[PDB]
Structure formats: structure tokens, C-alpha cells
Amino acid sequence: HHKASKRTQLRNELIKQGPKRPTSAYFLYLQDHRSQFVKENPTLRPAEISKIAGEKWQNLEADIKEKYISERKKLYSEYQKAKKEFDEKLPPKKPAGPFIKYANEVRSQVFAQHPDKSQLDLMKIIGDKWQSLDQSIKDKYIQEYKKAIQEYNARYP
Amino acid sequence: KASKRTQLRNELIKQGPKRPTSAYFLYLQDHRSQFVKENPTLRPAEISKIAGEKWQNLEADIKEKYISERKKLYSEYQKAKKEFDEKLPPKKPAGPFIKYANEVRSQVFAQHPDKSQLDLMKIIGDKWQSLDQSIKDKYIQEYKKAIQEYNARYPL
DNA sequence: AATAATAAATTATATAATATAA
DNA sequence: TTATATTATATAATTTATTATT
DNA sequence: AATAATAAATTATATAATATAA
DNA sequence: TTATATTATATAATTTATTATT
């Protein structure tokens, strides 16, 4: 929907060269037994080899499905750490605006009072609450943002 | 969906010399300042609309100078463009059908003067379909030598 | 736009936790 | 929030890009 | 996706020869 | 071939992206 701004493009390009999600468990069984399914089944398309591997997967003994599941869990948590560290060194986004700040304060109370509404209807309610605020109260949130952006610009000139 | 050599070639072509501006833009370059001092209340786009009015009525001996200037810059661009294009890696050679179409197109057009290029190529596709196989093979073999030389002179 | 042959890119496929889009 | 995308891989069968011309 | 304020990006506009796309 | 894009520039005025959260 929203065409990436030039700061967002850099962030997106930076992200694209960071750590990536590890492979799935089912895939791990493939990478170990790729030369075994062709040696054993040399007569169907490469896509058909995959279909029997998935049939093999749904009917395979549980110990087996667990072993390679264990490997995905190890690979993912090391990716989790690696992604966490990377993400922290990324160029920080701008501070949220006055409304976002207000919304992140009253959201708990508003949900507690409208538990029947979806979050999207909740944000509609929160948006109308902001519109209704006393001007001196909006000013508090506009001043918080002024302080936040002044600090942000002092930290990244 | 974008071919390997095409990526390299398009990247080079991106560095090519850009075509020059119009005669009117030249006139706008020299006069915009004065136009804003004359009409201090108009949006920058309305300035441009007034520039357009001024350009159309401008003294014809003055417009000619800007036109002449434009022509001069365009000639220089053409020289730079041709000089640039001769340094590019060439496109692949045309396919056998294309070479055939190019050799028979004039005669076919003379036989079908009322047909567009699109319709002509339909006709020429049909003629290719009925060409003797040993004649098709001349074009196919011609193309094989072409692509060989091509891959020799411009390898990835 | 049309054309045909050939080069080059893409898809067909299975999994499923989960990151990401909207 | 819900709905879609992503991550691993091998290679056939397939699609679509390339090319000159008006 | 919803939300508001704010930051960033794009449009408004004149030409007209001609390149480029289709 | 016909139909559209390209090239230059100023800078208000206007439109779109950003931002956290679910």
C-alpha cells in the first residue's frame, strides 16, 4: 500500500541482509535424504518427489518427526538471538506522534471498557477520544512529542 | 523478467546521456525570475502558465534563437548518444525467423500494400511456416554461428 | 502491438512455525 | 488484530524474454 | 487494516521534438 | 505503425508515508 520512503528503503534493504529464518523440520529430513529419494524413485517429476515426502511426513513414526523438530528448535533460537542483536543496531525510527502516545496510554482502559469491540473499532474509539480531549490536554501530548523529537534530533543530527 | 545480460546492459544504458531540454525551457530558464517579480501573487505553476503564454507570443526572431540553441544541444546529444551506443555490448543476434522476415519484407509489402506491419508479420509468419526445410535451415545455421560469435565476444 | 526460434527465468512441490503485510 | 509470506532444495516441465521491423 | 499529527514526497504547470513503449 | 514518455525548473500546494499497537 504505502510506497516506501527513502529511509524505509534503507531499513528494508538493511533488514534483507540480516539474519534470516531457518529452514523447517520437514525440510531438514529432505537435506539429509535428497540423494536417497532419487536413487530410490527416479521416475517422477521433482515436484512429485516432494509430494511423497509430505505423505511420508504425515505417516512417519513420531520419534522421527521429533528428532528433526528438535533441530528446527535449536536453529530458530540461535536465529532469534541473532535477529534480536541485529535489530538493535538498526537505525532507530522516529518517535511516535502525540496521538500514538496518547493511544498507547489509554488503550488498556478503553479495552477494559469496550471488551466487545475489535481492536480496529477500538482505535476508532480512541481516535474520537483524542479529538474530544481538552486542548490543554492535547498540548501535553504535543509537548511530549516536541521533547521526544528534540532529543531524537540532538542524538541524530 | 529480467535477463542476466539485459541487467548489465540496462545498467549501462541507464548511464547514457539524457536528451536535452526544449526551446521553451531555455526561454523559461532565462526569464522565470522576471516573471515572478512581475506577478508576485501566482503559484509557481501559474508562473509556468504565464511563461507559456509569453513563449507563444514571443518575438519570432527571439524564439528562433532558442530553437536554434535547442537544435544545437540536440545535435550534441545525438553525437554523444551514438558514441555511447557504440561502446555498449550489443544485443543478441536476431532469430532465424526475424532474419527471414527482414529479407522478404519488401517483396511481401509490395504484394500487400494495404496491410500494417502487424498484418505483414502474420503473412510472413505463414510464409516461414511453408518455407522449404533446407531454406529454414540456412537461417537457423546462420543464427547458430551468430550466437556462437556473440557468446565469444560477450561472455558473462 | 504482430511474428518464431532460442535463451533464460520461473514454477511445481512437500512442511509449519512465525515473521510480516494490511 | 487477521490474513499472507517466508525459510530450506532439487531439477523437470513450463512459461516468458529476446530480437528487428513499422 | 484502524487511528492523528507530522514528516516526507509529489503535484502543479508551461513545450514540442523525438525517443521509447506496445 | 500509433501512443505515450522524456527532457528541463521553480516552489507553493497538496497528497502520501510514518509511527505503535492488536
Burial of B154 (0-12, 13-18, 19+ CB in 10 A): middle
For residues B109 and B88, what is the distance between their CA atoms, to the nearest angstrom?
Answer: 33
On strand D, nucleotides with any atom < 7 Å from a protein CB are: 1, 6-13, 16-22
Q: How was this structure determined?
A: X-ray
The experimental resolution of this structure, in angstroms, equals 2.2
CB atoms inside a 10 Å sphere around CB B123 = 17
Within chain B, strands assigned E span none
Q: Under 8 Å CB-to-CB from A121, ≥6 apart: which residues?
A: A114
Q: Which of residues 3-32 of A touch strand C (CB under 7 A)?
A: 15, 21, 24-27, 30
How many angstroms is C1' of D20 away from CA of B93? 9
Q: Which of residues 77-96 of B touch strand E (CB under 7 A)?
A: 78
**Minimum-distance nucleotide, CA of A120 to C1':** E2
Domain limits of chain A?
A: 1-93, 94-157
Q: Find the angle CA(B127)-CA(B133)-CA(B136) to the nearest 5 degrees.
A: 65
- Residue A33 is placed in which grid cell? 535424504
Q: Give the residue whose CA sits closest to E5 at C1'.
A: A97
Burial of B124 (0-12, 13-18, 19+ CB in 10 A): buried
CA atoms within 13 A on the CB side of B132: 3
Alpha helices by DSSP H, A41-134: 46-59, 62-89, 98-113, 119-132
